[PDB]
């Protein structure tokens, strides 16, 4: 039983996990109580009674979100033991969540997760949901990720955070949180997935064609993304590939481990009639430069990996033909020593959309986890934002006054610079 677990921390983490677990209970025919009126054993521990408890733990330093999910329809879904709650948010400080208040609940959550691990038969990895510029999503998550790497290291620590947007910035100190968590994540992350806000806005604007979506829709898309990611574990496909192969398959180098997601089809209910939904056309649509979840121009970065995940009645012959055709495209770019990077996650378990959601019932769906040098420019601009904010040492008093120093600020900055050097040297 390739059983894996997930943790959800911070408002992004908890809501995204909420979406993920509502979708799993729906795809598995699981009631909010936790029973199906085997396949699902990887994520749902079966109790003595007719109940399948999710193998997830929601942890936050602020009781509001965990309180609301306790008031949500899925309190009976969750064993109230997992809902570890703090008292005050990380005040948008990596300093806090990594040095001040973390060292007081990390032991509790580690005991929780080791209890789940000993509950688990064959452990696969970890799914941490959080932010990057958020305080707890940087501090607390860096603390956990290093602590778990100390605990296991061998397990597949799959970090699934949110990449901050270039233009729109809800908080004001995001450069600090981002540079600090990446300083403490790069050396112990198997691979961290990246999601942006502006791209999801553009997708729901021009592809889903929705003018006013809430975070619920963003999280719905994220939930479909992870469901397609994990369908290989949850279901049998023509070619099943799991998370363990992902480390070697995606990253070409130990440190270049930041792929970006992309979902397809991303059309609303109206275009379902205007489309006959071919595998080739969605195969092209997922590769187009306005369909990715990260604000970059993929035509401007050599690709290193494109893990394509499929679901539904799809034959590998036409998929092979379509990917061969896309390989013949001129705009698409690759590196030298990886001229055959097309690994496919074909599966014959169709996706199911939540009732009351946005996406229509599509016989086939494809998600690609692109990893390319195009995100190097986004990294460069975020590092530039951090460098300019730190130039006049604005705001720095809070972080230094919750356990931080400028020396490792500059160390993280030069680590970002070395990351960019790695990016450009892989590009050539």
């Amino acid at each position: 039983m390739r059983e894996c677990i997930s943790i959800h921390v911070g408002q992004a983490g908890v809501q995204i996990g909420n979406a993920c677990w509502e979708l799993y209970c729906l795809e598995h025919g699981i009631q909010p109580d936790g029973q199906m009126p085997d396949s699902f054993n990887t994520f749902f521990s079966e109790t003595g009674a007719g109940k399948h408890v999710p193998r997830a733990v929601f942890v936050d330093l602020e009781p509001t979100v965990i309180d609301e999910v306790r008031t949500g329809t899925y309190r009976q879904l969750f064993h109230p033991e997992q809902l570890i709650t703090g008292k005050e948010d990380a005040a948008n400080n990596y300093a806090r969540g990594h040095y001040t208040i973390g060292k007081e609940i990390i032991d509790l959550v580690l005991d929780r997760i080791r209890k789940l691990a000993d509950q688990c038969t064959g452990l696969q990895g970890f799914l941490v949901f959080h932010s990057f510029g958020g305080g707890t999503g940087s501090g607390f998550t860096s603390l956990l990720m290093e602590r778990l790497s100390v605990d296991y290291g061998k397990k597949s620590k799959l970090e699934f955070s949110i990449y901050p947007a270039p233009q729109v910035s809800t908080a004001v100190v995001e450069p600090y949180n981002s540079i600090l968590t990446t300083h403490t994540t790069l050396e112990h992350s198997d691979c961290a997935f990246m999601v942006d806000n502006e791209a999801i806005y553009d997708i729901c604007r021009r592809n889903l064609d929705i003018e006013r979506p809430t975070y619920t829709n963003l999280n719905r898309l994220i939930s479909q993304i992870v469901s397609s990611i994990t369908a290989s574990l949850r279901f049998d496909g023509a070619l099943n590939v799991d998370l363990t192969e992902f480390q070697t398959n995606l990253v070409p180098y130990p440190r270049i481990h930041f792929p970006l997601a992309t979902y397809a089809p991303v059309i609303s209910a109206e275009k379902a009639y205007h489309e006959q939904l071919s595998v080739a056309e969605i195969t092209n649509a997922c590769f187009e430069p306005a369909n990715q979840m990260v604000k970059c121009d993929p035509r401007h970065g050599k690709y290193m990996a494109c893990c394509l995940l499929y679901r539904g009645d799809v034959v590998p012959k036409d998929v092979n033909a379509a990917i061969a055709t896309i390989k013949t495209k001129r705009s698409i770019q690759f590196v030298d020593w990886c001229p055959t990077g097309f690994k496919v996650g074909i599966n014959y378990q169709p996706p199911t959309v939540v009732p009351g959601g946005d996406l229509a019932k599509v016989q086939r769906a494809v998600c690609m986890l692109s990893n390319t040098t195009a995100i190097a420019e986004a990294w460069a601009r975020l590092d530039h934002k951090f460098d300019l904010m730190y130039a006049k040492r604005a705001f720095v008093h809070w972080y230094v006054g919750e356990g931080m120093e400028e020396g490792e600020f500059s160390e993280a900055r030069e680590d970002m610079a070395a990351l960019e050097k790695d990016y450009e040297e892989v590009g050539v």
Partner: protein, 428 residues
């Protein structure tokens, strides 16, 4: 649960606090008696940050009423929502500081300080977790100023961790009401900036004109002005006391809006300022609201933004609103008001949508901007100071109460320093 303590000082302070608690009781459906009778359980649940339950649904507001003239509290008792308080809280003297700050800090206030401090710290220990102190006061008279200064000094010397938040009423530039109010305000704000971390500039003529024209009012009674202040203060913390899609608290407003320690004086702002019956000449909606919230027509001081730059802004958007439109609107106002906008600090905005709207009003927002325009107010205050100082104008009242001009000179020097910081960061 991260509770907050409420302080009263001066007649204006007591009155604004009275209307404020009336507003909050309206928010949570609380009868004037103290028994809960609203329908929204959610407000009642989180009511512990303000209304500490005593017995059988009778909730005592966490209120401390401090004064030296018993008339104000006598009016409160006679007035509605006065008896709702636990009568132990009405801690007041008898003599009266007589609008003399030295009297308010070394005479009768200097002995009532302990008799109020006992109650306030007993209430604090009665509460679980604490955030800060809201000195709902005025700088007009000497009483609510002098004892307020002494009390914040005591609180800071005993509690270094909390984030106090004084809603100081800055004297009007023109409609002066006290002969020696400049000395009172200067001495108070000396000790404030010595310890405090957030004040505000409210001008009686500012609200006078706002209700005269924006609200189409003909009788600007202090009822109207202190009602506006109540709504503003209520919006300051509705993020903490209520759930939201993107929740904030006093900590957020404390650690984001201060690039520097001293530079911690603020300007609030609220919308919509609909007149009595203006529902027809425009249609209520959040775009027109955001348009009419950032203009100098809808500020709170006489510090015209046409001479200053918004260093940071912290729009909260209490209610239900779209992040997309506010992002576009802040970008556009950045484009147009860039001249009146800190070029050195970009991406300065703090959208913190909190779900619940105010009573009977679908949309609401509380502007909180760190406009670099207060230095004109401080310059006029210091000019009044030195003009009254060349002849020591009516200084005998202060000097006779064992006080020396050394402190006046230092306070004036420190206000000149504050003006220097404001201009030095407005131009730079």
């Amino acid at each position: 649960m991260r509770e907050i303590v409420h302080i009263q000082a001066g007649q204006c302070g007591n009155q604004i606090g009275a209307k404020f608690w009336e507003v909050i009781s309206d928010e949570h459906g609380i009868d004037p008696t103290g028994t809960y009778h609203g329908d929204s359980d959610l407000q009642l649940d989180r009511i512990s940050v303000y209304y500490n339950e005593a017995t059988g649904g009778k909730y005592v507001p966490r209120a401390i009423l401090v004064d030296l003239e018993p008339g104000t509290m006598d009016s409160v008792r006679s007035g509605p929502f006065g008896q709702i308080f636990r009568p132990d809280n009405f801690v007041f003297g008898q003599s009266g500081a007589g609008n003399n700050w030295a009297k308010g800090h070394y005479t009768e206030g200097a002995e009532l300080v302990d008799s109020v401090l006992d109650v306030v710290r007993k209430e604090a220990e009665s509460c679980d977790c604490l955030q800060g102190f809201q000195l709902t006061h005025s700088l007009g008279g000497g009483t609510g100023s002098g004892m307020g200064t002494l009390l914040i000094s005591k609180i800071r010397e005993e509690y270094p961790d909390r984030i106090m938040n004084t809603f100081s009423v800055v004297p009007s530039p023109k409609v002066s009401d006290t002969v020696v109010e400049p000395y009172n305000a200067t001495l108070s704000v000396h000790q404030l900036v010595e310890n405090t971390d957030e004040t505000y500039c409210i001008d009686n003529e500012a609200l006078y004109d706002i209700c005269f024209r924006t609200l189409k009012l003909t009788t600007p009674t202090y009822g109207d002005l202190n009602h506006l202040v109540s709504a503003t203060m209520s919006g300051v913390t509705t993020c903490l006391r209520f759930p939201g899609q993107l929740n904030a608290d006093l900590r957020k407003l404390a650690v984001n809006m201060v690039p520097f320690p001293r530079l911690h004086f603020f300007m609030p702002g609220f919308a919509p300022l609909t007149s009595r019956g203006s529902q027809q000449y425009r249609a209520l909606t959040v775009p027109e609201l955001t348009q009419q919230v950032f203009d100098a027509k809808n500020m709170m001081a006489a510090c015209d933004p046409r001479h200053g730059r918004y260093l940071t802004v912290a729009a909260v958007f209490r209610g239900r609103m779209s992040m997309k439109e506010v992002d576009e609107q802040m970008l556009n106002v950045q484009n147009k008001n860039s001249s009146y906008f800190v070029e050195w600090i970009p991406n300065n905005v703090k959208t913190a949508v909190c779900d619940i709207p105010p009573r009977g009003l679908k949309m609401a927002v509380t502007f909180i901007g760190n406009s670099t325009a207060i230095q004109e107010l401080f310059k006029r205050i210091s000019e009044q100071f030195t003009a009254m100082f060349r002849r020591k104008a009516f200084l005998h009242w202060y000097t006779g109460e064992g006080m020396d001009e050394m402190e006046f000179t230092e306070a004036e020097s420190n206000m000149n320093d504050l003006v220097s910081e404001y201009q030095q960061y407005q131009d730079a």
